[PDB]
C-alpha cells in the first residue's frame, strides 16, 4: 500500500466517477481521488529508488503530481458549484495526465495480460505427446527396447541429478535467467530430437529436458516474486488458467496438425521449434523482479518446522504424496511406450495420443475445479478416500497392464483419461491441506523437500524395475510389476485406514 495501491484505488475511483451519473455526490469521490493523489507523491517509487534524490529527473515526477492535484482542484472547484458536467472534463484531464506525466515513471500497464500471454504461449509445444511416435517410426528407426530400457530411465536419473542444484541456482538469480535457460533448453531438446541418429543423442535430449521439467516450481516462484502479495491471488489464478489453457491448446493444435492437417512429423517438429523460438523471444522480453524466496528469521522458520513434524496429518499426507507422485510419474513416463506397444501401427492418422493428452488435461482441469470445493475435514474422510482412490488407480493400472487387443486402444485411452482424472483430483486437496499450515517460505521448502523424496523413490523404483545392469525385466512384466506395486500400496493403505 505504498504507491501502487493508491494508483489502483485512484483508477477504481475513476471508474466510479466515469460510468456513473448524478455528479452531485462525486465530491466524496473527488476528495478520495485527492487523498490518493497526495498520498502517492513521495511514496518512494522503485524506478526512482535507483536514482538519487534532489535530481532534475525527479522534479518531473513531483511536478506531474502537482499539476495533477491542480487539475483535481480545477475539477472540484466546478463540481461544488452545481455543474455536474465537469466529471467528463476531469476524466479527460486524467487521461491526458496518464498519457503525459505519471506512466513514464511508473511500471508496465499490461503486466497481467503479458504474463497470461507468456503462460499461454510458452506452454505451446505441439510435438509434446508425439515424441514417442517420432522415435518409433521410419524417420529414425529406434526399437522398443532402446527407447524403453535405455533412454527414459536416464530421464528418471537426470530429474534427480538436476533437481537440487538447478533450484538452488534458481532461487538466487531472481528467476528471469532461469526462464531464459529454460527456453534455450527447449531449443536444445527439439534440436537434439531433430538432429539425432543414435541413442546418446536422445539421451542428451532427455538430459536437457529434465531442467525444463523441473522449472515448474521456478515459474510459480517467478509469479510469486513479480507480483505483490496484495495482488497475488487473482493474478496467480489467471496465470495458472493461462498455463492450463496453453497446454490444452498445445494438445489440440497437435491433434489438428497430425490428424486433421495430416502434417508429417518433420514439419510438425519444425513448427514446434518455431513456437519455441517465439517462446524464447517472449522470454527475452520479460521483466526481472528484485525479491526472491530465500535470498532477499531462519531460526523462527526452523522452530515452526520443528513444531509441525509431530503432526500425524502432515507426515501422512506427505508420505502419500511421495508414493502417489512417484507412481504417477512412472506411469506417465511409460504410458506412451505402452501405447505404441499395444498398437504398433505405422499410420500417423491412427495415432491419437494428443487426443488422450487433451482429454486428460481437460478432465484434470475439471477435477481440479471440483477439488477446491472439497471442504471435508480430516476427522471422517482422511484415509478411506485415499484407500478407495488408490484402489481405483491400481485397478486402472491393472487394466492398462493386460491390455493386448489391437482394437482396445480406445479403451486404453479411456482408462488413461480416468487415471489422470483420478490423480488430478488429489493434487489441489493435498495442496490445500498442506499449504494452509505454515508460512509461504516454509510451504515452498516443505513441498520442495517432498518433491525431492518423491524423486528419490522414483529413482529407486526405476533402478529396480527398468535397469539394464540390475534385473532387466521385459516391459510387459514391468507394467505387471507396476500393477502389483499399486496393489500392494492399496493393501497397505486399506490396512492402515482402519
Amino acid at each position, epitope marked *: 500500500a505504498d504507491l501502487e495501491d493508491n494508483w489502483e484505488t485512484l483508477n477504481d475511483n475513476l471508474k466510479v466517477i466515469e460510468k456513473a451519473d448524478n455528479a452531485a455526490q462525486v*465530491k466524496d469521490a473527488l476528495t478520495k481521488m485527492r*487523498a*490518493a493523489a*497526495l498520498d502517492a507523491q513521495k511514496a518512494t517509487p522503485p524506478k526512482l529508488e535507483d536514482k538519487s534524490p534532489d535530481s532534475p529527473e525527479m522534479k518531473d515526477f513531483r511536478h506531474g503530481f*502537482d499539476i495533477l*492535484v491542480g487539475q483535481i482542484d480545477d475539477a472540484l472547484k466546478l463540481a461544488n458549484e452545481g455543474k455536474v458536467k465537469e466529471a467528463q472534463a476531469a476524466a479527460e484531464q486524467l487521461k491526458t495526465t496518464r498519457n503525459a506525466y505519471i506512466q513514464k515513471y511508473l511500471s508496465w500497464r499490461h503486466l497481467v495480460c503479458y504474463l497470461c500471454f507468456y503462460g499461454f504461449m510458452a506452454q505451446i509445444r505441439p510435438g509434446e505427446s508425439f515424441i514417442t511416435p517420432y522415435l518409433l517410426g521410419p524417420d529414425k528407426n529406434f526399437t522398443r527396447e532402446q527407447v524403453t530400457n535405455e533412454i527414459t530411465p536416464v530421464l528418471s536419473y537426470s530429474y534427480l541429478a538436476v533437481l537440487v542444484p538447478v533450484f538452488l541456482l534458481t532461487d538466487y538469480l531472481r528467476y528471469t535467467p532461469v526462464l531464459l535457460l529454460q527456453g534455450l533448453s527447449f531449443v536444445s531438446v527439439w534440436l537434439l530430437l531433430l538432429l539425432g541418429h543414435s541413442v546418446a543423442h536422445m539421451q542428451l535430449m532427455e538430459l536437457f529436458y529434465s531442467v525444463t521439467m523441473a522449472a515448474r516450481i521456478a515459474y510459480s516462484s517467478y509469479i510469486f516474486s513479480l507480483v505483490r502479495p496484495a495482488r497475488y491471488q487473482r493474478v496467480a489464478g489467471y496465470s495458472r488458467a493461462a498455463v492450463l489453457l496453453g497446454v490444452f491448446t498445445s494438445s489440440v493444435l497437435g491433434q489438428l496438425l497430425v490428424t486433421v492437417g495430416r502434417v508429417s512429423f518433420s514439419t510438425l517438429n519444425y513448427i514446434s521449434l518455431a513456437f519455441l523460438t517465439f517462446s524464447v523471444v517472449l522470454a527475452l522480453f520479460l521483466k526481472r523482479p528484485k525479491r526472491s524466496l530465500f535470498f532477499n528469521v531462519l531460526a523462527r522458520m526452523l522452530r515452526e518446522l520443528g513444531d509441525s513434524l509431530r503432526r500425524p496429518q502432515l507426515r501422512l499426507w506427505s508420505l502419500w504424496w511421495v508414493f502417489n507422485s512417484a507412481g504417477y510419474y512412472l506411469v506417465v513416463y511409460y504410458v506412451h511406450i505402452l501405447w505404441n506397444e499395444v498398437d504398433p501401427t505405422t499410420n500417423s492418422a491412427r495415432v491419437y495420443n494428443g487426443a488422450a493428452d487433451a482429454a486428460s488435461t481437460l478432465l484434470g482441469a475439471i477435477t481440479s475445479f471440483a477439488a477446491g470445493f472439497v471442504k471435508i475435514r480430516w476427522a471422517r474422510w482422511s484415509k478411506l478416500l485415499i484407500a478407495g482412490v488408490t484402489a481405483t488407480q491400481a485397478g486402472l493400472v491393472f487394466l492398462l497392464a493386460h491390455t493386448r487387443h489391437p482394437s482396445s486402444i480406445w479403451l486404453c485411452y479411456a482408462a488413461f483419461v480416468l487415471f489422470r482424472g483420478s490423480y488430478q483430483f488429489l493434487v489441489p486437496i493435498a495442496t490445500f491441506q498442506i499449504a494452509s499450515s505454515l508460512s509461504k517460505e516454509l510451504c515452498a521448502l516443505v513441498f520442495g523437500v517432498n518433491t525431492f523424496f518423491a524423486t528419490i523413490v522414483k529413482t529407486i523404483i526405476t533402478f529396480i524395475v527398468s535397469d539394464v545392469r540390475g534385473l532387466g525385466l521385459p516391459v510387459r512384466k514391468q507394467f505387471q510389476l507396476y500393477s502389483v506395486y499399486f496393489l500392494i500400496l492399496s493393501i497397505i493403505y486399506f490396512l492402515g485406514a482402519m
Partner: antibody
Amino acid sequence: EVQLVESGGGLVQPGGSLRLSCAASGFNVVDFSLHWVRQAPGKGLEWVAYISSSSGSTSYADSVKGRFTISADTSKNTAYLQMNSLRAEDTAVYYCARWGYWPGEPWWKAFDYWGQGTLVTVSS
Amino acid sequence: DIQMTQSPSSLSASVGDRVTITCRASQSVSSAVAWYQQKPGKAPKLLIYSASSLYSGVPSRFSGSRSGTDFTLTISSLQPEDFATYYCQQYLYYSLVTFGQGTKVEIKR
C-alpha cells in the same frame, strides 16, 4: 511584518443582519486566500466559509449554507462576510486566517497568520 | 462531511513530562494535518504542519508523527507556557476543513 485584523462584530437581534470585515494588512488577497473560523463560547473551534479572489470559489459549511454570503475586494485589501437571518447558534467568536494556494509550500502551511478574532452575540 | 476525532480530551502533566495527543481520522486523509495552541482568550497559532514538520517560530520541544490515519503530537519537555488547548486541524481541500475536539492540558497536582 504582516498580520490580520477583524471588525464589525457586536450585538445583533435574531433574524437581523450583521457584516464583518477582515482587513489583510501587508500581503495581498490575490496571492493567498482568506477564511473564517468560528469558536462558540465553551465549545471548540469550527469552520464557516471562505473566498478565493483569484477565480471565485465561494463554498460554505453545512450549517451556514444558503444563509450567509461572502465578498472580497482586491482594491481595498480586505474581506467581508455579510450575514443575515442570524440564530442563537451564531453567538460565537469569529476568526479570519490566511491559507495559501496550490501548489508549493504555502499550501502545506496551514492557517498560520490568524487574526485578533471578533466577538458576535445574538440575544433578544 | 468528514470527521476528525481526538481522544485524550483531558490531560494532566507536571513541568517536565511527556504527553501524547492522538487524532484519528475518518477517511484516508494524506499527510496533511495541523496542530494548534489556543490560550484562553487569545488567537490560535500554527505549531505543526504537514504532520511532521515544525513551524518557523515555535521552539523545538514539539514534534509529530504519522501512522496511517492516526496522527499523534508529542511534547518532550512541558514548559509552563505550554498549558493551553491543542486542536487537530486536518486540511485536504478548501471546503473540507474540519477540526478536532480540543485537548486541555492541566498541571499535575
